[PDB]
Symmetry: none
Subunit: 81 residues, 5 copies
């Protein structure tokens, strides 16, 4: 077995490498909401009264330029007004 990756590089890369080798990750989370994700054993077993109300108010705006998108020779601008 012989794994060869990115040998004799000459000039100015932009690299993002993760190497896993076996013989015998990237996570992004933005504005994530979870309600009552997990409870215990036997909750609210008898005569339970629950009023559940959630409010996410207001206008929401998301602006993303080139998500998961490498650049070689480029110009990127997010111009608002």
């Amino acid at each position: 077995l012989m794994v060869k990756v990115l040998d004799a590089v000459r000039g100015s890369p932009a690299i993002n490498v993760a190497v896993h080798v076996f013989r015998k990750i990237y996570k992004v989370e933005i504005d994530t909401k979870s309600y009552w994700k997990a409870l215990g054993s036997s909750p609210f077993h008898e005569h339970a009264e629950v009023v559940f109300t959630a409010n996410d108010s207001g206008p929401r705006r998301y602006t993303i330029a080139a998500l998961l998108s490498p650049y070689s020779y480029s110009t990127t601008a997010v111009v608002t007004n």
Copy 2:
């Protein structure tokens, strides 16, 4: 076995490499909502009264330029007004 990846590179790439080798990932999550994802054993077993109300209010706007889209020689602009 001999894995060869990206040898003798000469100039100015834009690379995103993940290599897995076996012998014998990228996750993005934006504005994700989950209600009552998992509970325990025997909930609300007898005589349960539940009022469930969820409110996601307001106008919503999403703007994405070149999701999963590499650039070689380009211009990208998200011009608002």
Copy 3:
């Protein structure tokens, strides 16, 4: 076995490579909603009264330019007003 990928590159790529080799992924999630995804064993077994109401209010707008679409020599603009 001999896997050869992207040898002797000369100039200015835009690459997105994932290599899996066996001998003997990319996930994007935007504005995903899940209600009551999974519960436990024997819920609401006897005499259960449930009022379930969900409200996703407001106008919604999505604008995506070249989803899963590489660029070689191009111009991309999302001009609003």
Copy 4:
């Protein structure tokens, strides 16, 4: 077994390498909310009265330029007004 990564580099890279070798990650979390993530054994067993109210008020704005996107020769600007 012989793992070779990034040998004889010549000039000015921009590298992000994580190498795992076995023989015989990057996490970003921005504005994450969790309510009642996990409770103990047998909560609210008998005659429980709960009023649950959550308020996330105000307009929200997110602006991200080139999330997970290496740069080789480029200009990036987020110009607001």
Copy 5:
């Protein structure tokens, strides 16, 4: 077994390397909120009255330029007004 990483470097890199070798991570958290993360055994067992109210008020703004995105030859500016 012989792991070789980043040999005979010549000039001006920008490196971020974590190497794990076995024979026989980076976490960023910004504005993270958790309510009632975990309680003990048998809470609120009998005749419990709870009024739960949470208020996250005010407009919120997040601006991020090149999250997880190395630079080779570039200019980055976040110009507000």
